[PDB]
């Protein structure tokens, strides 16, 4: 380009070529799970009387 644009492109480039900063990203996924089933049940069977 014209020397006028060369000097303008030269500032654009200098700004645009800046050392891009780096990022360390730690994620922390914590899950906790449990639970209590209970099955208690009583059956009575009688020949004479009846069964449950």
């Amino acid at each position: 380009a014209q020397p006028d644009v060369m000097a303008e492109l030269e500032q654009v480039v200098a700004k645009l070529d800046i050392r891009r900063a780096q990022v360390l990203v730690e994620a922390i996924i914590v899950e906790i799970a449990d639970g209590d089933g209970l099955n208690l049940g009583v059956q009575w069977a009688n020949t004479n009387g009846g069964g449950t």
Binding site: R19, R20, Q22, L24, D34, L38, L40
Partner: protein, 52 residues
């Protein structure tokens, strides 16, 4: 973007898993010491620390 001499972290995953299971008898399984006689416990744990 890393310096010409330097050894660095790209990324990494530190993963930790712990599954705990018991098949116990409701009341008896909860006796703090004797209770381990009623319970059939299955525990599991793992660790992976990966660094690039």
């Amino acid at each position: 973007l890393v310096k010409s001499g330097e050894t660095v972290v790209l990324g990494g995953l530190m993963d930790e898993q712990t599954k705990e299971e018991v098949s116990k008898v409701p009341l008896l399984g909860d006796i703090p010491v004797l209770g381990y006689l009623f319970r059939s416990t299955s525990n599991n744990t793992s660790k992976r620390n990966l660094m690039v």
